[PDB]
Paper text:
ATP-hydrolysis-coupled [name] polymerization is a fundamental mechanism of cellular force generation. F-[name] polymerization is coupled to the G-to-F transition, a substantial flattening of the [name] subunit that renders its nucleotide cleft active site competent for hydrolysis.
Replacing KH2PO4 with K2SO4 produced intermediate severing, suggesting that phosphate specifically caused the substantially reduced severing of ADP-Pi–F-[name] rather than altering the buffer’s ionic strength. In both nucleotide states, extensive water-mediated hydrogen-bonding networks stabilize the ligands. Notably, in ADP–F-[name], four water molecules displace the inorganic phosphate’s oxygen tetrahedron. As is typical for helical reconstructions, the highest-resolution map regions were the filament cores, which revealed a continuous solvated channel aligned with the filament axis. This positions the filament core to contribute to extensive solvent-mediated lateral interactions between strands, which occur at a vertex between three subunits (Fig. 2b (top)).
Numbering used by the authors:
A (entry chain C), B (entry chain B), C (entry chain A): 5 to 375
Write the structure that this text describes.
């Protein structure tokens, strides 16, 4: 049969079929409900909206994310999103297809236990499997050795792998990702008199961040350049026709990744996190780890982030080591591509958690069979 | 059965049957009583006259409007007018027909409470409903999204609606409409030596306003043109054969809608009111609101008012927005047409306030069931 | 010398001298201009009126607030108000006194830049400083640890402080305050047939709100009590002798603070805002924050608001935490009292921005020296 690969991220849902080169369905992972009163009768109105239909009508809706920091917090909305993905986007029968799901490392066990329970009971899938997103990203690049830096909307994490072996004690997890950057940009936009307070306005700020933000190679030099002249300013048109102009915010927003103290976090930056993850591994594999830094996720798509990470890691690493950052242009879907590749492999077909095994063992079997 | 749609405006009464394309009965909402002494015996004389019979004999009558600024102030005369509408104009049995009534937004609650009480007790209707006039106007145009500018004889108001959802906090209400314009024209006609002081003469001034007034595209240029020559002057024949000539008054009278300060009001014009109502809505629906400005009411029938409103809103709106004014030729009866359409809908048949519900709950049920 | 403390709020101006226990001058921050025509010659008439003189003659004036939502929007009127405060109220020479000014957090930078420029150029003050209002309120209570809820006429904001250290990432700002409540009461007064439309009538509605509104401990029980009987009704006399009676509106008006959806806002209430601000701080300071909730501003003077906030925060906080609301009877002037205390401190005398520093650095120095 044909397996289903579903990457349930905090911000976007990636779904498709195993063997394909790109995900079939990509849409935001949101559920919207009306907050005003309906005075017009005879027209089709629904109590909830999911995905693009919620984005289109966001002006009269309150938008909620069921997944927060890679943890599912509203299982009703998550089930609604899964139903939407299975029926309206891919248009498939769930019980006729094994499904591969993704999860961030160091997550609560109950999250994947409930994922398995929902998949086996509500949708009655024949088989399912839960994988780590960082390993799938390594699969997508055709590599067996390297350290993967994956940063999406909720979670940023590092996983070092050498010759197909993972070192769990060196796994790092950070709760700073895209959504936090969007909130910080939303806060700092008030310096120029721009006020965004609603969940519909938050999406507008996210679009502005995606379309106008970049990572500066040197932060203080960029600050001086922005203070000296107006060559770095850009204009953006709001949906109602208003035009806003932003200056140093464009690179101030992504700077939080390297300086988490901008949002009040004591943790270190992504470069120092990667260096510490490398230094926790055996001395005989650090040289290979230094040359196989793999980037994945939407938050790694800022212009100039790879050069900045290269510079920082070079400044941290010994001068005789060769630092190489791997940033494929398609790294936005590396997790899904690796999941499809894994589901297409012949040797993986006996690693599926089947319905019989679940009926015998309960939801706890995902701990024994998956990682 | 067949539902009855009655639009009780400040100036005119519109009545008919649901499913019809036009109101069956249209007549002024006035009650007249003699003010001289009857010296002739043996002839049929009545203590009161309603509607067209009052208009025909206005020379010996004092005319009173029971509705003032969309608020009923004389319930005895209002009951007389309702009896006239039910029995002499439509010629129907009130207890055999559900009745749909209209009301302006931001009205006193006691007004509709007494309307419901009168309908259920005096006329013993089986069911009744009170709708908002601007919503019905939106129904008449076959739209679910737009901002409605309704201006009749007593009230001018704006109601923005998006995807069938109303935003009550953005609803505007103005107490400048046709009657105020008639009074202002009555006052300014004294500059040419014309004196109208009675309620019968006020009707003559209203006819003059309806037949000779228009909205100037640019007020000061029209002023200069009227001062330069006499190309804008028109002649009107009084009922007794006298002929009057008016110049700049023709467009001075409707100018009060855009400059309320002409009658001593501090409020802004209709264009600024519409712009402020649009700006109070969510940023993601303002573009659709800009292109769906719907006009309704008799006061919107001045020649050239739509172009003036388009110009003003374009001058107020951002240059990249598309401003479109919708002014149907039948907008004089948009409220009644929308009411008939709503009463003809199948899904509305369970929204009627029935006699049993009124007997159970009292007059206050109209607040819970209607809007 | 003697420093000047000026608290420029959206609704009122508080001014005086450092070291005093109360502000010397309190008057509304309004500028009024005549809207009728002057027909009497030989009498003293002015083109503008400021403060109490504008309030006294409001019947023939249009009233404008130069400050909107803590942001100065009319700098000419603001300069007129500053001139009035300096010369007619305090009767002092501006160049002989350093001046301390206040501002709300998360404000546009250009606002304080222009404030500094106006103070240094137009009035030629020797030194000036801009402080955050919530910090000054904490100064007034003799505390170094606590979370301050300040709500005036334009802005409501929360600032948590622990051991003299502020956590900027946990600062909350809300654009719902007294003026919005006045507008909502103005809108809901139409349910009883009372119509207030002018800026002079808006002041009357504000007086009614100040004199008759209170916060209900339980909203639905108060609704049921008001519906059952008339024990909650009060009477108010209009300036022309008319008497109005209001029922549930008295506590419906302040309820918008806890339910912003009454005016169409998606944001949460003040209690939930305070709880979220507390939860964003470090876990080791939340216990001290829970017991030091400080109220400040005119909008916190509603009867029963402190008990309602205590109940809500207790319902939100863990059952083992001790919730304490600090509501001094003089919290109406807490910002000014704290500003005077700060200006009287010996260690603050070197934090003044002096004329030499401004001449060297330009208006941008307020960003580097102030917070
Ligand atoms: N061009 C871009 N520049 C910066 N950030 C981006 C860009 N495109 C997407 N993002 C951000 O990436 C995040 C979503 O990416 P994704 O890896 O799909 O996250 P998740 O897997 O958590 O859904 C969002 O926060 C989005 O704003
Ligand atoms: N052709 C016209 N030009 C200008 N005003 C008109 C015209 N026809 C009617 N009116 C005015 O419209 C008002 C009544 O219209 P209508 O919408 O029926 O009001 P209502 O619903 O309050 O009775 C009256 O003031 C009348 O003078
Ligand atoms: N007793 C009261 N009850 C309720 N509101 C009040 C009371 N006294 C003053 N206010 C309101 O407080 C606001 C002004 O207080 P203030 O803290 O001086 O604001 P600002 O600093 O913005 O001028 C006004 O909206 C006023 O109506
Ligand atoms: Mg992801
Ligand atoms: Mg009408
Ligand atoms: Mg204040």
């Amino acid at each position: 049969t044909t397996a289903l690969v579903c990457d349930n991220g905090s911000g976007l849902v990636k779904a498709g079929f195993a063997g394909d080169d790109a995900p079939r369905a990509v849409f935001p992972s949101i559920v919207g409900r009306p907050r005003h009163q309906g005075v017009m009768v005879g027209m089709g109105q629904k109590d909830s909206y999911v995905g693009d239909e919620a984005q289109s009508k966001r002006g009269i809706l309150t938008l909620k994310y069921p997944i927060e920091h890679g943890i599912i917090t509203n299982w009703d909305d998550m089930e609604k999103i899964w139903h939407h993905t299975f029926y309206n986007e891919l248009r498939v029968a769930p019980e006729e297809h094994p499904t591969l799901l993704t999860e961030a490392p160091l997550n609560p066990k109950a999250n994947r236990e409930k994922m398995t329970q929902i998949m086996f009971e509500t949708f009655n899938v024949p088989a399912m499997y839960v994988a780590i997103q960082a390993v799938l990203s390594l699969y997508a690049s055709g590599r067996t050795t390297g350290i993967v830096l994956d940063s999406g909307d909720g979670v940023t994490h590092n996983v070092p792998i050498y010759e197909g072996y993972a070192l769990p004690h060196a796994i790092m997890r950070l709760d700073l990702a895209g959504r936090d950057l969007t909130d910080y940009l939303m806060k700092i936009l008030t310096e120029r008199g721009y006020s965004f307070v609603t969940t519909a306005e938050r999406e507008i700020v996210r679009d502005i961040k995606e379309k106008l933000c970049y990572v500066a190679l040197d932060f203080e030099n960029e600050m001086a350049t922005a203070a000296s002249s107006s060559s770095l300013e850009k204009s953006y048109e709001l949906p109602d026709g208003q035009v806003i102009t932003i200056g140093n915010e464009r690179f101030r927003c992504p700077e939080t990744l390297f300086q988490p103290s901008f949002i009040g976090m004591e943790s270190a930056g992504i470069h120092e996190t990667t260096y510490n993850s490398i230094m926790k591994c055996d001395i005989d594999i650090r040289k290979d780890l230094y040359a196989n830094n793999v980037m994945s996720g939407g938050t790694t798509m800022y212009p100039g982030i790879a050069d900045r990470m290269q510079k920082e890691i070079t400044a941290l690493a010994p001068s005789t080591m060769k630092i190489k950052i791997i940033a494929p242009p398609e790294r936005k879907y590396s997790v899904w591509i690796g999941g499809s590749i894994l589901a297409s492999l012949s040797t993986f077909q006996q690693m599926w958690i089947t319905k019989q095994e679940y009926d015998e063992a309960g939801p706890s079997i995902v701990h024994r069979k998956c990682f």
